[PDB]
Design a protein around this nucleic acid. Structure first.
Ligand SMILES: [Mg+2]
Lengths: 87, 49, 49, 49
DNA sequence: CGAACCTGGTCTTGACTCCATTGCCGGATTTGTATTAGACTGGCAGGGTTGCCCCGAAGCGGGCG
DNA sequence: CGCCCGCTTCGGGGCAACCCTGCCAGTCTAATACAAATCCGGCAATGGAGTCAAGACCAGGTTCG
């Protein structure tokens, strides 16, 4: 049954979620909120730049600046060695 | 040997034979043997989870 | 200190399943203690457990 | 090929029904087999692996 | 003790690009349905041999209103 | 006269161990004619979503008077 639950990717995915929430908690709060809303990690609904700037009450260019700054922070390998093995 | 491998289609048992992984058939007489010991939890293990 | 079971089909009676403490052995054949051959009805003609 | 078909009553009758084949005796995970050899230096509660 | 700096971002504003997303709109293709006027008129066709057990069905000899 | 029931036989379903080990089975009147549906290919309304350039804006760490 090649669509059955493989039972090792599931626990790898749960460990991915735990480690990913830890690494996203290593940042500040506006940053992690922007990342979680930009990639839908809180409900499965991917919020875009205008919704995020609306729910934070700023402009969308500020949201894109914060997005680029944090995604530059995450590509630093100190925030990345614990996630590199997850591909 | 098998820890977790392929699974059967209609029923959801582990598969069979060294060509796949498969497990060994914990058949009916072995169920009788572990009943006769009185090991109830291990029988529940081997037939559910 | 983590025991395993040793089935031998056909499990005629209650002592076909016993629990042994395992230990690591060079090679690929399960080493069985000789004093349970009478319970397992296991000569060493190529029997598998 | 002139093979009789398998109706609903043939899913339960005989040795290949759900009862004798998949309800009572299941393939299990966390399992394995091998050929056996004599272990005359083992303790009684030990075994090879 | 103050002046001036230059730099950490913080945020906004406007201008521009790109891109999905319907919306027609027309041709291609795909699927369904109908119609063929000489006469034609009751199937192939195969297997199947164990033995034992329990039970239920059909039948035959036995007596009888 | 025809009427009914006790043993006999005929048939019919159920069962006959258990581990591994294997892996994918068949065949002919034949096309037109049309219409609904579907689909797919190409511009054409976008406006939303992203992207950059520029700056205003602070208020704090760095240096000169
Ligand atoms: Mg033997």
């Amino acid at each position: 049954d090649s669509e059955a639950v493989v039972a090792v990717d599931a626990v790898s995915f749960t460990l991915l979620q735990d480690q990913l929430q830890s690494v996203l908690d290593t940042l500040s709060e506006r940053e992690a909120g922007v990342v979680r809303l930009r990639f839908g990690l809180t409900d499965g609904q991917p919020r875009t730049l205008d919704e995020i700037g609306q729910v934070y009450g700023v402009t969308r260019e500020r949201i894109r600046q914060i997005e680029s700054k944090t995604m530059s922070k995450l590509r630093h390998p100190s925030r990345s060695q614990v996630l590199r093995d997850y591909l | 040997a098998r820890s977790t491998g392929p699974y059967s289609m209609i029923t959801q048992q582990p598969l069979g034979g060294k060509a796949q992984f498969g497990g060994q058939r914990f058949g009916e007489m072995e169920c009788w043997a572990m009943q006769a010991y009185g090991a109830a939890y291990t029988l529940q293990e081997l037939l559910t989870i | 200190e983590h025991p395993v079971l040793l089935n031998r089909a056909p499990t005629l009676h209650r002592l076909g399943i016993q629990a042994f403490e395992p230990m690591l052995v060079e090679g690929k054949a399960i080493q069985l203690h000789p004093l349970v051959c009478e319970a397992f009805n296991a000569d060493f003609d190529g029997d598998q457990m | 090929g002139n093979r009789p078909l398998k109706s609903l009553s043939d899913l339960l009758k005989g040795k290949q029904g759900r009862f004798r084949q998949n309800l009572l005796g299941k393939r299990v995970d966390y399992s394995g087999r091998s050929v056996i050899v004599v272990g005359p230096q083992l303790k009684l509660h030990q075994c090879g692996l």
